[PDB]
Amino acid sequence: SSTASALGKLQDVVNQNAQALNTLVKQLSSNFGAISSVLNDILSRLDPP
């Protein structure tokens, strides 16, 4: 009841899953060498080719 941090295994498993999901979502905001990270910007500014 009093002392905490005795259940670190379950907590760290949960934190690992959350961190993986967060980094996967945040990866969507990267140019990867392109000119922008949002498709509609390319589809509106540039021509098809």
Add this chain to the structure above:
Amino acid sequence: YADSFVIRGDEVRQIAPGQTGKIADYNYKLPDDFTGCVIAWNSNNLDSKV
């Protein structure tokens, strides 16, 4: 398939896939994945009249 016509001297460049201009969008369009060849030659001797 063979397509033949006569155009001005400066418009020959417009005949290309993914090309934008006047002929390239209002008179003759080529598909982006077009396969084949294009031939052009001057005709100022006979196709030009005084």
